[PDB]
Each structure stands twice: as structure tokens, then as C-alpha cells.
């Protein structure tokens, strides 16, 4: 997250760190949202590589013991069947991860609530992106979980020629684009939390930013629209 602030450690208890095994250690690669005690929602593109993945819930500082973490292996990966890794603009950038164990819930570890199917946010709706992704274009990962306030940009504006044009689909949510605050590499797969009727819900799964940089004016961060995939999510969980 470029232009973020450090999150309080109990603000976003559904945020997870998706990590892969790297030598004798683990490396953060993406975010995710805990949606059942044994299921995480992330971006399909985060699990394109043939790696050993784990999830960390209750994580705050990637580089220090928080005293709250639970580390769990990924047992099964179910990518959306229409996902195509060389065409992120087509959409379908979503995957579910079944965890090897069911995590224990507490103030640091909670299920993300999802919007009702079909819900579309009005333009300029209040949301936060969260994650440990780069804090500058071509920068480095954050140590501590970051948040940035990113107002939605509705489809009509986001798919206009000076924004994303044809590349944004109605199956996506756009947020931000102010040239200061954005998602960045390593935030993919994590949540966009939007405040609706007094309650935050996870309306987005971070999918992409501009090839020209993270915080680029009129290139808002683009997220898979969770509310387009409710039936898919429920179907996967019910059949696994
Ligand atoms: Na930690």
C-alpha cells in the first residue's frame, strides 16, 4: 500500500498473509481474507506459481513476533475455472484456499463478512485497502499492516478512456486513483473493506494496478468484485 497508515492490530482481523516457502524461510506474496475458519479468499493470480503456500492469520508485523499469529498450510486451491493468467483484464481473479487446520477466532482472527450478491457501491463510497504490499512503486514490502482510504470509482468513470477504458469490467471494483494512495505489489489477493449500513464488508479482492506504477492518477486500484462471486464461493465451499 502506497500512501497508507499503519493499521491498528485489531482493525482488520480477516486480513491474512499468503506466503510461500523460500529456502529455509517463508516470504509474503499476497493478501487474502479469512471467510471460514478453514477457507481463505484470495486472487487467482497469487497462486499461479507452483509453490508451497501457507496462510498466516493474526499477523501484524511480518518481521516480528506479534504473539497472535496462527500459521497454517494450504491444503487445496480452487481457482475460478474461467481465470486466465495471461489475461487479468478478463476478470475472474479469485481463488479459494482450504486450510489444513481450522483457525481459532479471537480479536485478531475473524471471518470477513461479504456483501450480498449483486451489490454495487455508489461512486465515491468509503473504503480501505489493507496489506503488506510495497509502500512505493518499485519499493519494498511494509513490515506492519498498512491501510489506505480509497473511495470507489464507479464503472462508468473507471471504464472511461482516461481511466482504465476496456480493461475494467463490471465484475470489478475500482478504488482510489488519486496519485498518492494505492494498492501495490504484494497487496494482491487482500481485501477492500467498504463501510455500508454501519458495517464494513469485503467488497473487493485486490487484482491489479497500472504497469506504469502503483499510485498513478486516474489508474485506481482494481479489485475483483466479491458480490459477483457469492454463488461461486458458496458452491466451492459446499463441494469441498
Ligand atoms: Na508477526
mmCIF file of C-alpha atoms and ligand atoms in Angstrom:
data_model
loop_
_atom_site.group_PDB
_atom_site.id
_atom_site.type_symbol
_atom_site.label_atom_id
_atom_site.label_comp_id
_atom_site.label_asym_id
_atom_site.label_seq_id
_atom_site.Cartn_x
_atom_site.Cartn_y
_atom_site.Cartn_z
ATOM 1 C CA UNK A 1 0.000 0.000 0.000
ATOM 2 C CA UNK A 2 1.387 3.347 -1.129
ATOM 3 C CA UNK A 3 0.367 6.313 0.988
ATOM 4 C CA UNK A 4 -1.025 4.192 3.803
ATOM 5 C CA UNK A 5 -1.022 4.455 7.549
ATOM 6 C CA UNK A 6 -0.244 1.640 9.985
ATOM 7 C CA UNK A 7 -3.385 -0.277 10.840
ATOM 8 C CA UNK A 8 -4.321 -0.865 14.454
ATOM 9 C CA UNK A 9 -3.658 -4.581 15.063
ATOM 10 C CA UNK A 10 -7.362 -5.431 15.690
ATOM 11 C CA UNK A 11 -8.948 -3.315 12.950
ATOM 12 C CA UNK A 12 -8.935 -5.858 10.096
ATOM 13 C CA UNK A 13 -8.968 -9.326 11.731
ATOM 14 C CA UNK A 14 -9.972 -11.087 8.473
ATOM 15 C CA UNK A 15 -6.790 -9.987 6.693
ATOM 16 C CA UNK A 16 -4.296 -12.835 6.139
ATOM 17 C CA UNK A 17 -0.754 -13.024 4.775
ATOM 18 C CA UNK A 18 -0.308 -15.587 1.990
ATOM 19 C CA UNK A 19 3.308 -16.769 1.981
ATOM 20 C CA UNK A 20 5.425 -19.215 0.032
ATOM 21 C CA UNK A 21 8.338 -21.352 1.100
ATOM 22 C CA UNK A 22 11.662 -19.766 0.115
ATOM 23 C CA UNK A 23 14.740 -21.713 1.138
ATOM 24 C CA UNK A 24 14.622 -22.128 4.890
ATOM 25 C CA UNK A 25 12.119 -19.327 5.317
ATOM 26 C CA UNK A 26 8.748 -18.038 4.190
ATOM 27 C CA UNK A 27 8.099 -14.981 2.023
ATOM 28 C CA UNK A 28 4.945 -12.873 1.946
ATOM 29 C CA UNK A 29 3.494 -12.743 -1.544
ATOM 30 C CA UNK A 30 -0.169 -11.711 -1.294
ATOM 31 C CA UNK A 31 -3.039 -10.899 0.942
ATOM 32 C CA UNK A 32 -6.269 -12.775 1.486
ATOM 33 C CA UNK A 33 -9.480 -12.697 3.501
ATOM 34 C CA UNK A 34 -10.424 -15.395 6.002
ATOM 35 C CA UNK A 35 -14.012 -16.328 5.056
ATOM 36 C CA UNK A 36 -14.462 -19.575 7.022
ATOM 37 C CA UNK A 37 -12.292 -20.990 9.792
ATOM 38 C CA UNK A 38 -10.727 -23.225 7.117
ATOM 39 C CA UNK A 39 -11.158 -21.116 3.931
ATOM 40 C CA UNK A 40 -9.366 -18.070 2.562
ATOM 41 C CA UNK A 41 -10.413 -15.922 -0.387
ATOM 42 C CA UNK A 42 -7.533 -14.548 -2.472
ATOM 43 C CA UNK A 43 -6.677 -13.608 -6.063
ATOM 44 C CA UNK A 44 -6.191 -16.414 -8.613
ATOM 45 C CA UNK A 45 -3.021 -14.782 -9.889
ATOM 46 C CA UNK A 46 -1.451 -15.115 -6.466
ATOM 47 C CA UNK A 47 -1.491 -18.901 -6.748
ATOM 48 C CA UNK A 48 -0.429 -19.239 -10.427
ATOM 49 C CA UNK A 49 3.026 -20.372 -9.339
ATOM 50 C CA UNK A 50 3.637 -23.977 -8.328
ATOM 51 C CA UNK A 51 4.790 -23.058 -4.797
ATOM 52 C CA UNK A 52 4.250 -24.330 -1.273
ATOM 53 C CA UNK A 53 1.850 -21.848 0.341
ATOM 54 C CA UNK A 54 0.875 -21.108 3.917
ATOM 55 C CA UNK A 55 -1.518 -18.648 5.438
ATOM 56 C CA UNK A 56 -0.832 -16.558 8.500
ATOM 57 C CA UNK A 57 -3.816 -15.261 10.453
ATOM 58 C CA UNK A 58 -3.398 -12.867 13.370
ATOM 59 C CA UNK A 59 -0.425 -11.319 11.601
ATOM 60 C CA UNK A 60 0.583 -7.698 12.075
ATOM 61 C CA UNK A 61 4.340 -7.381 11.629
ATOM 62 C CA UNK A 62 5.795 -9.751 9.036
ATOM 63 C CA UNK A 63 9.238 -9.381 10.613
ATOM 64 C CA UNK A 64 8.474 -9.722 14.395
ATOM 65 C CA UNK A 65 6.609 -11.964 16.760
ATOM 66 C CA UNK A 66 3.201 -10.410 17.454
ATOM 67 C CA UNK A 67 2.144 -13.124 19.882
ATOM 68 C CA UNK A 68 -1.114 -13.539 17.961
ATOM 69 C CA UNK A 69 -0.187 -15.425 14.791
ATOM 70 C CA UNK A 70 -1.501 -18.806 13.679
ATOM 71 C CA UNK A 71 0.375 -20.448 10.782
ATOM 72 C CA UNK A 72 -1.490 -22.922 8.628
ATOM 73 C CA UNK A 73 -0.744 -24.809 5.472
ATOM 74 C CA UNK A 74 -2.823 -24.577 2.311
ATOM 75 C CA UNK A 75 -4.407 -27.978 1.668
ATOM 76 C CA UNK A 76 -6.429 -27.309 -1.502
ATOM 77 C CA UNK A 77 -6.516 -24.476 -4.051
ATOM 78 C CA UNK A 78 -9.661 -23.859 -6.099
ATOM 79 C CA UNK A 79 -9.127 -21.190 -8.736
ATOM 80 C CA UNK A 80 -12.086 -19.745 -10.632
ATOM 81 C CA UNK A 81 -12.416 -22.003 -13.704
ATOM 82 C CA UNK A 82 -12.619 -19.034 -16.114
ATOM 83 C CA UNK A 83 -9.338 -17.445 -14.806
ATOM 84 C CA UNK A 84 -6.658 -16.966 -17.463
ATOM 85 C CA UNK A 85 -3.307 -15.864 -16.111
ATOM 86 C CA UNK A 86 -2.225 -14.015 -19.269
ATOM 87 C CA UNK A 87 -5.497 -12.025 -19.344
ATOM 88 C CA UNK A 88 -6.097 -10.445 -15.925
ATOM 89 C CA UNK A 89 -8.305 -7.839 -17.643
ATOM 90 C CA UNK A 90 -10.837 -10.526 -18.422
ATOM 91 C CA UNK A 91 -11.555 -10.852 -14.721
ATOM 92 C CA UNK A 92 -12.181 -13.991 -12.675
ATOM 93 C CA UNK A 93 -9.166 -13.109 -10.487
ATOM 94 C CA UNK A 94 -10.324 -15.082 -7.455
ATOM 95 C CA UNK A 95 -9.409 -18.306 -5.746
ATOM 96 C CA UNK A 96 -10.351 -20.140 -2.567
ATOM 97 C CA UNK A 97 -7.796 -21.866 -0.342
ATOM 98 C CA UNK A 98 -8.873 -24.648 2.014
ATOM 99 C CA UNK A 99 -6.611 -24.605 5.063
ATOM 100 C CA UNK A 100 -5.140 -27.755 6.597
ATOM 101 C CA UNK A 101 -6.497 -26.785 10.014
ATOM 102 C CA UNK A 102 -9.381 -24.609 11.184
ATOM 103 C CA UNK A 103 -8.077 -21.470 12.799
ATOM 104 C CA UNK A 104 -9.231 -20.229 16.190
ATOM 105 C CA UNK A 105 -11.171 -16.928 16.226
ATOM 106 C CA UNK A 106 -10.349 -14.006 18.532
ATOM 107 C CA UNK A 107 -9.986 -10.209 18.259
ATOM 108 C CA UNK A 108 -7.120 -10.737 15.790
ATOM 109 C CA UNK A 109 -8.723 -13.543 13.730
ATOM 110 C CA UNK A 110 -12.299 -13.168 12.424
ATOM 111 C CA UNK A 111 -14.248 -14.053 9.327
ATOM 112 C CA UNK A 112 -14.616 -11.363 6.708
ATOM 113 C CA UNK A 113 -18.195 -10.516 6.001
ATOM 114 C CA UNK A 114 -19.083 -10.455 2.336
ATOM 115 C CA UNK A 115 -21.662 -8.247 0.615
ATOM 116 C CA UNK A 116 -24.955 -9.505 -0.568
ATOM 117 C CA UNK A 117 -24.872 -10.841 -4.106
ATOM 118 C CA UNK A 118 -25.185 -8.171 -6.807
ATOM 119 C CA UNK A 119 -24.380 -5.213 -4.557
ATOM 120 C CA UNK A 120 -22.748 -2.325 -6.429
ATOM 121 C CA UNK A 121 -21.330 0.617 -4.492
ATOM 122 C CA UNK A 122 -22.273 4.177 -5.411
ATOM 123 C CA UNK A 123 -19.436 6.230 -6.827
ATOM 124 C CA UNK A 124 -17.091 7.600 -4.157
ATOM 125 C CA UNK A 125 -18.092 5.109 -1.487
ATOM 126 C CA UNK A 126 -15.778 4.930 1.543
ATOM 127 C CA UNK A 127 -13.361 2.001 1.569
ATOM 128 C CA UNK A 128 -9.955 0.975 2.906
ATOM 129 C CA UNK A 129 -7.425 -1.240 1.213
ATOM 130 C CA UNK A 130 -5.192 -3.183 3.596
ATOM 131 C CA UNK A 131 -1.988 -5.112 3.091
ATOM 132 C CA UNK A 132 1.757 -5.543 3.406
ATOM 133 C CA UNK A 133 2.498 -4.703 -0.219
ATOM 134 C CA UNK A 134 5.063 -2.259 -1.483
ATOM 135 C CA UNK A 135 4.951 1.166 0.077
ATOM 136 C CA UNK A 136 6.230 2.831 -3.115
ATOM 137 C CA UNK A 137 6.242 1.876 -6.753
ATOM 138 C CA UNK A 138 9.335 -0.337 -7.171
ATOM 139 C CA UNK A 139 9.779 -0.198 -3.392
ATOM 140 C CA UNK A 140 9.697 -2.806 -0.657
ATOM 141 C CA UNK A 141 7.056 -4.595 1.363
ATOM 142 C CA UNK A 142 5.727 -2.996 4.508
ATOM 143 C CA UNK A 143 6.684 -4.594 7.805
ATOM 144 C CA UNK A 144 3.448 -3.681 9.544
ATOM 145 C CA UNK A 145 -0.033 -3.966 8.050
ATOM 146 C CA UNK A 146 -0.979 -0.788 6.206
ATOM 147 C CA UNK A 147 -4.359 0.727 5.353
ATOM 148 C CA UNK A 148 -5.244 3.448 2.847
ATOM 149 C CA UNK A 149 -8.519 5.236 2.291
ATOM 150 C CA UNK A 150 -9.566 4.570 -1.330
ATOM 151 C CA UNK A 151 -13.019 5.866 -2.422
ATOM 152 C CA UNK A 152 -14.719 3.775 -5.111
ATOM 153 C CA UNK A 153 -14.715 4.880 -8.749
ATOM 154 C CA UNK A 154 -17.851 3.555 -10.402
ATOM 155 C CA UNK A 155 -17.876 1.545 -13.617
ATOM 156 C CA UNK A 156 -18.923 4.450 -15.823
ATOM 157 C CA UNK A 157 -15.966 6.544 -14.722
ATOM 158 C CA UNK A 158 -13.492 3.711 -14.277
ATOM 159 C CA UNK A 159 -14.086 2.316 -17.791
ATOM 160 C CA UNK A 160 -13.813 5.802 -19.385
ATOM 161 C CA UNK A 161 -10.918 6.439 -21.696
ATOM 162 C CA UNK A 162 -8.738 8.454 -19.313
ATOM 163 C CA UNK A 163 -9.144 5.827 -16.576
ATOM 164 C CA UNK A 164 -8.951 2.103 -17.434
ATOM 165 C CA UNK A 165 -11.044 2.022 -20.621
ATOM 166 C CA UNK A 166 -11.968 -1.512 -21.796
ATOM 167 C CA UNK A 167 -9.682 -3.205 -19.288
ATOM 168 C CA UNK A 168 -12.118 -2.692 -16.377
ATOM 169 C CA UNK A 169 -15.177 -4.923 -16.346
ATOM 170 C CA UNK A 170 -18.386 -4.719 -14.362
ATOM 171 C CA UNK A 171 -17.138 -7.773 -12.434
ATOM 172 C CA UNK A 172 -14.507 -5.473 -10.848
ATOM 173 C CA UNK A 173 -14.453 -2.626 -8.346
ATOM 174 C CA UNK A 174 -12.182 0.354 -8.849
ATOM 175 C CA UNK A 175 -10.998 2.419 -5.873
ATOM 176 C CA UNK A 176 -8.643 5.308 -5.410
ATOM 177 C CA UNK A 177 -6.733 6.804 -8.333
ATOM 178 C CA UNK A 178 -5.670 9.993 -6.555
ATOM 179 C CA UNK A 179 -1.980 9.596 -7.462
ATOM 180 C CA UNK A 180 -0.962 9.377 -3.783
ATOM 181 C CA UNK A 181 -2.644 6.295 -2.264
ATOM 182 C CA UNK A 182 -2.996 2.864 -3.808
ATOM 183 C CA UNK A 183 -2.522 -0.810 -3.644
ATOM 184 C CA UNK A 184 0.858 -2.102 -4.829
ATOM 185 C CA UNK A 185 2.610 -5.398 -5.450
ATOM 186 C CA UNK A 186 2.123 -7.753 -2.528
ATOM 187 C CA UNK A 187 -1.350 -6.371 -1.717
ATOM 188 C CA UNK A 188 -2.995 -8.577 -4.386
ATOM 189 C CA UNK A 189 -5.497 -11.028 -3.044
ATOM 190 C CA UNK A 190 -6.289 -8.954 0.012
ATOM 191 C CA UNK A 191 -9.472 -7.127 0.922
ATOM 192 C CA UNK A 192 -11.064 -3.850 0.018
ATOM 193 C CA UNK A 193 -13.222 -3.097 3.083
ATOM 194 C CA UNK A 194 -16.193 -0.784 2.454
ATOM 195 C CA UNK A 195 -18.455 0.711 5.060
ATOM 196 C CA UNK A 196 -22.121 0.068 4.279
ATOM 197 C CA UNK A 197 -25.059 0.446 6.696
ATOM 198 C CA UNK A 198 -22.622 0.854 9.504
ATOM 199 C CA UNK A 199 -20.723 -2.381 8.873
ATOM 200 C CA UNK A 200 -17.510 -2.991 6.902
ATOM 201 C CA UNK A 201 -17.714 -5.735 4.316
ATOM 202 C CA UNK A 202 -15.103 -7.082 1.940
ATOM 203 C CA UNK A 203 -16.283 -5.812 -1.465
ATOM 204 C CA UNK A 204 -13.004 -6.357 -3.332
ATOM 205 C CA UNK A 205 -10.119 -8.786 -3.817
ATOM 206 C CA UNK A 206 -7.085 -6.758 -4.915
ATOM 207 C CA UNK A 207 -6.284 -7.691 -8.512
ATOM 208 C CA UNK A 208 -4.162 -5.166 -10.421
ATOM 209 C CA UNK A 209 -2.597 -1.737 -10.729
ATOM 210 C CA UNK A 210 -1.070 0.083 -13.721
ATOM 211 C CA UNK A 211 2.078 -1.301 -15.366
ATOM 212 C CA UNK A 212 3.254 2.317 -15.144
ATOM 213 C CA UNK A 213 3.124 2.357 -11.336
ATOM 214 C CA UNK A 214 1.063 1.752 -8.229
ATOM 215 C CA UNK A 215 -0.136 5.251 -7.343
ATOM 216 C CA UNK A 216 -0.933 6.694 -10.801
ATOM 217 C CA UNK A 217 -3.590 9.387 -11.128
ATOM 218 C CA UNK A 218 -6.697 8.030 -12.901
ATOM 219 C CA UNK A 219 -5.468 4.458 -12.578
ATOM 220 C CA UNK A 220 -7.341 3.423 -9.437
ATOM 221 C CA UNK A 221 -6.515 0.101 -7.907
ATOM 222 C CA UNK A 222 -8.685 -2.638 -9.430
ATOM 223 C CA UNK A 223 -10.305 -5.390 -7.394
ATOM 224 C CA UNK A 224 -12.392 -8.445 -8.213
ATOM 225 C CA UNK A 225 -15.986 -7.558 -7.189
ATOM 226 C CA UNK A 226 -16.785 -10.053 -4.431
ATOM 227 C CA UNK A 227 -20.537 -9.547 -4.842
ATOM 228 C CA UNK A 228 -20.341 -11.011 -8.366
ATOM 229 C CA UNK A 229 -18.975 -14.296 -6.977
ATOM 230 C CA UNK A 230 -21.190 -15.141 -3.973
ATOM 231 C CA UNK A 231 -22.753 -18.165 -5.659
ATOM 232 C CA UNK A 232 -19.387 -19.363 -6.903
ATOM 233 C CA UNK A 233 -17.852 -19.073 -3.427
ATOM 234 C CA UNK A 234 -20.765 -20.878 -1.779
ATOM 235 C CA UNK A 235 -20.681 -23.615 -4.435
ATOM 236 C CA UNK A 236 -16.962 -24.235 -3.930
ATOM 237 C CA UNK A 237 -17.229 -24.404 -0.163
ATOM 238 C CA UNK A 238 -20.257 -26.731 -0.343
ATOM 239 C CA UNK A 239 -18.471 -29.127 -2.739
ATOM 240 C CA UNK A 240 -15.197 -29.228 -0.772
HETATM 241 NA NA1 LIG B 1 4.363 -11.233 13.180
#
